[PDB]
Design a protein around this ligand. Structure first.
Ligand SMILES: *[C@@H]1O[C@H](CO)[C@@H](O[C@@H]2O[C@H](CO)[C@@H](O[C@@H]3O[C@H](CO)[C@@H](O[C@@H]4O[C@H](CO)[C@@H](O)[C@H](O)[C@@H]4O)[C@H](O)[C@@H]3O)[C@H](O)[C@H]2NC(C)=O)[C@H](O)[C@H]1NC(C)=O
Ligand SMILES: *[C@@H]1O[C@H](CO)[C@@H](O[C@@H]2O[C@H](CO)[C@@H](O[C@@H]3O[C@H](CO[C@@H]4O[C@H](CO)[C@@H](O)[C@H](O)[C@@H]4O)[C@@H](O)[C@H](O)[C@@H]3O)[C@H](O)[C@H]2NC(C)=O)[C@H](O)[C@H]1NC(C)=O
Ligand SMILES: *[C@@H]1O[C@H](CO)[C@@H](O[C@@H]2O[C@H](CO)[C@@H](O[C@@H]3O[C@H](CO)[C@@H](O)[C@H](O)[C@@H]3O)[C@H](O)[C@H]2NC(C)=O)[C@H](O)[C@H]1NC(C)=O
Ligand SMILES: *[C@@H]1O[C@H](CO)[C@@H](O[C@@H]2O[C@H](CO)[C@@H](O[C@@H]3O[C@H](CO)[C@@H](O)[C@H](O)[C@@H]3O)[C@H](O)[C@H]2NC(C)=O)[C@H](O)[C@H]1NC(C)=O
Ligand SMILES: CCCCS(=O)(=O)N[C@@H](Cc1ccc(OCCCCC2CCNCC2)cc1)C(=O)O
Ligand SMILES: *[C@@H]1O[C@H](CO)[C@@H](O[C@@H]2O[C@H](CO)[C@@H](O)[C@H](O)[C@H]2NC(C)=O)[C@H](O)[C@H]1NC(C)=O
Ligand SMILES: [Ca+2]
Ligand SMILES: [Ca+2]
Ligand SMILES: [Ca+2]
Ligand SMILES: [Ca+2]
Ligand SMILES: [Ca+2]
Ligand SMILES: [Ca+2]
Ligand SMILES: [Mg+2]
Lengths: 477, 448
């Protein structure tokens, strides 16, 4: 039938093909009475004229770099294929599937709070191990990890500390005739870092202090750890873990009334250039609500490692505080390592992608097929991605017209992944046969016109097939 | 709301830590306010007591004269030194007849005898002021000649070195003052009851240490469950066993039995009559226990605040709001059981239940009404006070009225408040809130 190629065209190969992609050109000479050279490929085949000169360009996607994705040693292939080469026609659409698989391990930042009370001394050694041992567990579980720790005793205010004799201020252990360092509220020791040896050395360097009341200000230390960002150097794009160690009761909110401190501990950091809680004497123990809010907002999981003697207290605390876990702090920390592994096993990442260096003229559409094997249109990322899962996205790109540049290069970058997909697109507006050119030919009415793939275009108006109709003549009625 | 007077004080002195009402024999009613960090003539923060008269404009008040000078007494080859520096005078102020009792739990007291010393621990000393007679006496059951070594050798039994005397103060109808100090017995806590007249008569100048024959201290308990429980954090006086003659003492401990907290009702002889335990743990059950017949049938009822209580409404999200527990005394000689009622707050992290100040009856009809503190409540998170209109059945969950905190952030408005006393003699109690953060006290008259 007439279709669309035959109509609204039949002037040149470029315009003839520009009507629609599904058009073909018959370069070889044939009968012009049937309006050939612009019609469906099937119609041209029925009309012959296929001496290897058929001009029916199509869009073909060529893969340049398609290294296999990592399955498990210096490749780390997260996106495959890596580099794509594509050829497009004006007013055309084509689809391509891109697969992405997780390779890199999940980063982790761990904070360790230690008590340095006199009572803790007997168990102090043990808690130190619980630090370093825990680090070892994360050393064999992941490659990217940061670890930091801080120490706490109690607020530096009476009656929590001895004031008589005056030497008690610099050495409260006067009754026992022993030397102990002054008791302090909170003292951040090591910021988050990958230097495990320095972490162990600083943990071992810590000593013990003395206080009066059995409860200790662990809530202040927890709030300081979970409230300071620059001092602790938390990473936004990484999981966070907190491990607090103790042996005896822990101070709770409103206890400072005994020492004369009533102002709460707000969600602000009060440790700068001194590694000390300057406002400890004027800030009260934060309640469980503030700590829970900080943990939820910062996405921090808290593990209370305590001795079996008062383990029930911290079991009750965990029951009251969602998201935290309880473990036994003793010669063996298996009950803590198992809980840490279980918590780390629930970490879930997200796979999102963005496109850059693309002119707004081109249009794009996509569908998502995650591990659920369900095709969803309009969603560029599912929820609940785990290491080893492969996600395939079918992106369909449509281009209208032929850009003057004729060559473009754009990038598809997954969110949080350095690797990216580089796609180079080319366009072929002109026809191959036009390479012949033949500016002058005797068939254009004795060399008075231009010839192009079987059609003579001549003069400023000469439109006849033989290039003889002229511009003022050829006016039949 | 307009008639909300403000009483100020010295700049940067935490004016409003504790407040109470005083009614001297002259017939003039005043507000006693204790600023722990009052700046004295020596440019040192020790503590001050302000007897503000009822003034519409409020403002600064004439600080009542008190012995802020250290007394280096010598007796019995021993030196008694009163370390009044940073003593926090005014943490608990009460009145009875023409006597004003102002206690300083942080007033460190020391005894020097050769190398050994008693240490300047916060024993707690209470000044008795009688302006009409111009008398300034001192009372301190915690103070004693016993040395630290004696306490250490006897397993710390009857440890009266860090009592923090005067943490809670009550005046009985008979005329005997009862002081509860949770710091006694090595933070276990203790109670000491003594007539005011006996101590006043036995007081002599320049002594600072003298045994009182009429003193009655609590009996020490060796049960580990009481260790670090703070038995004495809140003290109330009432009747629960039906004996009108005898006065029963209710002691609310927030850290009793591994932070669970509880309230113990005991007879006048410091013998346990009944015990009550909270439902949820870590809620600070026992910060302030009040005794009042909410139902109104002649039997006192117990009110306990738990500011740290955590509740949940949707998604099983445990959020800290606070709670109030009501225990009703059963008719006849019957022991109390589970909490009669439980009331929950609205604001998040408001510490609803930190302090409970009885208001007696608001509408003066027969139904008792109470007030509770939310020191850091409100949409902004500055402070709130919730008024509960009691009912014969019990206490309504939804408060009748809520008062916000006009002071800036950090004022901790509502932390300390007292009621059940009328200043203008209008027939209704007048509420006072000791906002220490702003160094101001807010007085508002409750108009039903
Ligand atoms: C004691 O009482 C004061 C109230 O006066 C409490 O608040 C303190 O107020 C003083 C006011 O002298 C303030 O110091 C001033 O800070 C100014 C900057 O804000 C200084 O520069 C001033 O700037 C003005 C605006 O540009 C200008 O007009 C003026 O001429 C001057 O140049 C000024 O010189 C003073 O140094 C304190 O910062 C302020 N403190 C706080 C914490 O806000 C004070 O808090 C009370 N004391 C306690 C312990 O609470
Ligand atoms: C915090 O952790 C502790 C563990 O250290 C949990 O202890 C548990 O406490 C409950 C009681 O709340 C125990 O259940 C029973 O308790 C009764 C004693 O309570 C009795 O209660 C009745 C009213 O029901 C009263 O009339 C009685 O006078 C008396 O007070 C006891 O007799 C039972 O045998 C039984 O133990 C539970 O056993 C106990 N568990 C352990 C391991 O000790 C505590 O529940 C927990 N806090 C919260 C809020 O769960
Ligand atoms: C990625 O997912 C999208 C879903 O939005 C797929 O688009 C769908 O593709 C199919 C062809 O595979 C289209 O089918 C055609 O539908 C038209 C009617 O619109 C019909 O006339 C044709 O005969 C044919 O059936 C479909 O319309 C289109 N849209 C939807 C909503 O399904 C896309 O194909 C997927 N990617 C790949 C590479 O398959
Ligand atoms: C404690 O309760 C008892 C009752 O259980 C109260 O006892 C009362 O004491 C008064 C005296 O103070 C008694 O009055 C007496 O009356 C007789 C005449 O019958 C007279 O001769 C005496 O001189 C005396 O005035 C009264 O009868 C007695 N009550 C009873 C029921 O016998 C006591 O007052 C209470 N304690 C306090 C401090 O209130
Ligand atoms: C063991 C004495 C020294 C304790 S401390 O001053 O060094 N403080 C400990 C914590 C602690 C507190 C109290 C305690 O029980 C004290 C026992 C009190 C017994 C009371 C019981 C009731 N009757 C009076 C005595 C044990 C340890 C520190 O880590 O710094
Ligand atoms: C992209 O679209 C083409 C068609 O435009 C799809 O081609 C199909 O390829 C499969 C084999 O891979 C054949 O079995 C189908 O018959 C083809 N269909 C058509 C209509 O040609 C192609 O699958 C799509 N996806 C990708 C990644 O190229
Ligand atoms: Ca220990
Ligand atoms: Ca301590
Ligand atoms: Ca009785
Ligand atoms: Ca009753
Ligand atoms: Ca009423
Ligand atoms: Ca009034
Ligand atoms: Mg300790």
């Amino acid at each position: 039938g007439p279709n669309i190629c035959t109509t609204r065209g039949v002037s040149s190969c470029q315009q003839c093909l520009a009507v629609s992609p599904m058009c073909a050109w018959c370069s070889d000479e044939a009968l012009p009475l049937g309006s050939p050279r612009c019609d469906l490929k099937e119609n041209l085949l029925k009309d012959n004229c296929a001496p290897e000169s058929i001009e029916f360009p199509v869009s073909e996607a060529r893969v340049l770099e398609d290294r296999p994705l990592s399955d498990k040693s210096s490749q780390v292939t997260q996106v495959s294929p890596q580099r794509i080469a594509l050829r497009l026609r004006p007013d055309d659409s084509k689809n391509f599937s891109i697969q992405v698989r997780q390779v890199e391990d999940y980063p982790v930042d761990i904070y360790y709070l230690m008590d340095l009370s006199y009572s803790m001394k007997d168990d102090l050694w043990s808690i130190q191990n619980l630090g370093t041992k825990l680090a070892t567990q994360m050393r064999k579980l992941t490659s990217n990890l940061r670890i930091g720790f801080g120490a706490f005793v109690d607020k530096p205010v009476s009656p929590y500390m001895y004031i008589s004799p005056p030497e008690a201020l610099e050495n409260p252990c006067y009754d026992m005739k022993t030397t102990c360092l002054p008791m302090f509220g909170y003292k951040h020791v090591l910021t988050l870092t990958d230097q495990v040896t320095r972490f162990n050395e600083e943990v071992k360097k810590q000593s013990v202090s003395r206080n009066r009341d059995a409860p200790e200000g662990g809530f202040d230390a927890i709030m300081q750890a979970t409230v300071c960002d620059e001092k602790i150097g938390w990473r936004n794009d990484a999981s966070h873990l907190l491990v607090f160690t103790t042996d005896a009761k822990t101070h709770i909110a409103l206890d400072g009334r005994l020492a004369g401190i009533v102002q709460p501990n707000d969600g602000q950091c009060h440790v700068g250039s001194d590694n000390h809680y300057s406002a400890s004497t004027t800030m009260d123990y934060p309640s469980l609500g503030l700590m829970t809010e900080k943990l939820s907002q910062k996405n921090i999981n808290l593990i209370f490692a305590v001795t079996e003697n008062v383990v029930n207290l911290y079991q009750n605390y965990s029951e009251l505080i969602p998201g935290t876990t309880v473990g036994v702090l003793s010669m063996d920390s298996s009950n803590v390592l198992q809980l840490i592994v279980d918590a780390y096993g629930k970490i879930r990442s997200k796979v999102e992608l963005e496109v850059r260096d693309l002119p707004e003229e081109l249009s794009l559409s996509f569908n998502a097929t995650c591990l659920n094997n369900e095709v969803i249109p309009g969603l560029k990322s599912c929820m609940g991605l785990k290491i080893g899962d492969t996600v395939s996205f079918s992106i369909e790109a449509k281009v209208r017209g032929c850009p003057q540049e004729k060559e473009k290069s754009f990038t598809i970058k997954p969110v949080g992944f350095k690797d990216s997909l580089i796609v180079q697109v080319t366009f072929d507006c002109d026809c191959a046969c036009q390479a012949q050119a033949e500016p002058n030919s005797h068939r254009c009415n004795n060399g008075n016109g231009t010839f192009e793939c079987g059609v003579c275009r001549c003069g400023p108006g000469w439109l006849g097939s033989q290039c003889e109709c002229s511009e003022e003549d050829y006016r039949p009625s | 709301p307009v008639q909300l007077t403000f009483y100020a004080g010295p700049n940067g002195s935490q004016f409003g830590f504790s407040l109470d009402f005083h009614k001297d024999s002259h017939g003039r009613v005043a507000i006693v306010v204790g600023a722990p960090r009052t700046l004295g003539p020596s440019q040192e923060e020790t503590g001050g007591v302000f007897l503000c008269p009822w003034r519409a404009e409020g403002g600064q008040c004439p600080s009542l004269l008190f012995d802020l000078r250290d007394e280096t007494r010598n007796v019995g080859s021993q030196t008694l030194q009163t370390f009044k520096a940073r003593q926090g005078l005014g943490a608990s102020v009460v009145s009875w007849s023409d006597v004003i009792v102002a206690c300083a739990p942080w007033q460190h007291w020391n005894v020097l005898e050769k190398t050994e010393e008693a240490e300047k621990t916060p024993v707690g000393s209470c000044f008795l002021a009688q302006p009409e007679s111009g008398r300034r006496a001192e009372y301190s059951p915690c103070r004693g000649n016993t040395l630290s070594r004696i306490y250490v050798e006897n397993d710390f039994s009857w440890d009266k070195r860090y009592c923090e005397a005067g943490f809670s103060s009550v005046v009985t109808q008979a005329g005997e003052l009862v002081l509860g100090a949770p710091g006694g017995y090595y933070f276990l806590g203790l109670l000491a009851q003594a007539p005011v007249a006996d101590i006043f008569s036995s007081y002599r100048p320049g002594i600072l240490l003298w045994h009182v024959s009429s003193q009655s201290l609590s009996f020490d308990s060796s049960n580990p469950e009481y260790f670090d429980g703070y038995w004495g954090y809140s003290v109330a006086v009432g009747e629960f066993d039906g004996d009108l003659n005898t006065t029963e003492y209710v002691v609310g401990a927030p850290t009793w039995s591994w932070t669970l907290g509880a309230v113990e009702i005991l007879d006048s002889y410091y013998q346990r009559l009944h015990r009550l335990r909270g439902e949820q743990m870590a809620s600070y059950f026992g910060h302030s226990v009040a005794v009042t017949d909410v139902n109104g049938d002649g039997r006192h009822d117990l009110l306990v605040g738990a500011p740290l209580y955590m509740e949940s409404r949707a998604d099983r999200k445990l959020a800290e709001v606070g709670r109030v527990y009501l225990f009703l005394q059963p008719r006849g000689p019957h022991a109390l059981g589970a909490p009669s009622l439980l009331l929950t707050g609205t604001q998040l992290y408001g510490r609803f239940g930190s302090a409970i100040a009885p208001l007696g009856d608001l509408d003066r009809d027969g139904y008792n009404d109470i007030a509770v503190a939310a020191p850091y409540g409100g949409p902004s998170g500055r402070g709130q006070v919730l008024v509960f209109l009691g009912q014969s059945e019990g206490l309504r969950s939804r408060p009748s009225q809520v008062l916000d905190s006009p002071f800036p952030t950090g004022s901790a408005f509502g932390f300390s408040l007292r009621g059940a006393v009328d200043i203008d003699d209008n027939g209704y109690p007048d509420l006072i809130v000791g906002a220490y953060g702003a160094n101001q006290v807010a007085v508002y008259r409750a108009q039903p």
